[PDB]
Ligand binder design. Structure first.
Ligand code: C2K
Length: 217
């Protein structure tokens, strides 16, 4: 793969968002991956709706949690592949309240046809990332809680518990690192991002990487 990839420079990544007091990381990760894959496939960047998943995805558990693979499946099998825009279906669950599913009054911003699960291999993940755009991943976020900047090199890596968005990497750094977009506002980390070392499976980053497919069979 290339020595470095940063999908934020290419217009494939929306501004950092804030899940607030709701366990909706899984929906932020899903949506950020779709926003990325849609733009990289040749469409103008559009912000898409986490609220749609929180409120409408019957496989997952709203603010009680979920899985990106389940959200991808819901979008395709229950919503015809379609994803509403953020502007037309705004995120209101930051206070932890969960309105009922509203299917009316929205605009469709993107469509997906399937999803894929990547192998547990940092080089496969880098290549897929470099070709296709930002990826949904899960991490052990124990080390995220006290992060204030820099490259994490001894991240606790015991149990997955948080969904995030993998947006790039830089191999020409000592040490090499991955670039991850979090959903804890731009007041957390490096304006909402974190860097973790690449090549050492930091935070178990390789364990559950997935992506939507745009314009597939
Ligand atoms: N933000 C947030 C919260 N955490 C999560 O959403 C994590 C976010 C999360 C955590 C771990 C992850 C993934 Cl892919 C996401 O990879 C390991 C998955 C273990 C199974 O975790 C879940 C399974 C389900 C279920 F299968 F029942 F649908 C639902 C939720 C999780 C889960 O623990 N999701 C506090 C709810």
């Amino acid at each position: 793969a290339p020595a470095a990839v940063d999908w934020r420079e290419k217009g494939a990544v929306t501004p950092v968002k804030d899940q607030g007091q709701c366990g909706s990381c899984w929906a932020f990760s899903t949506i950020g991956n779709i926003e990325g894959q849609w733009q990289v496939a040749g469409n103008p960047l559009v912000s898409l709706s986490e609220q749609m998943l929180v409120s409408c995805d019957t496989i997952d558990f709203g603010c009680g949690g979920g899985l990106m693979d389940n959200a991808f499946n819901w979008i395709v099998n229950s919503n015809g592949g379609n994803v509403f825009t953020e502007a037309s279906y705004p995120y209101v669950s930051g206070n932890g309240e969960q309105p009922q599913c509203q299917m009316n009054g929205h605009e469709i911003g993107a469509a997906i046809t399937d999803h894929v699960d990547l192998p547990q291999d940092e080089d496969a993940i880098a290549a897929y990332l470099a070709e296709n755009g930002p990826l949904a991943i899960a991490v052990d976020a124990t080390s995220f809680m006290d992060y204030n900047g820099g490259i994490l090199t001894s991240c606790t890596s015991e149990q997955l518990d948080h969904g995030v968005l993998l947006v790039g990497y830089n191999d020409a750094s000592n040490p090499p690192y991955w670039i991850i977009k979090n959903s804890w506002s731009n007041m957390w980390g490096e304006d909402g991002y974190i860097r973790i070392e690449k090549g050492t499976n930091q935070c178990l980053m390789n364990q559950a990487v997935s992506s939507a497919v745009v314009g597939g069979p």
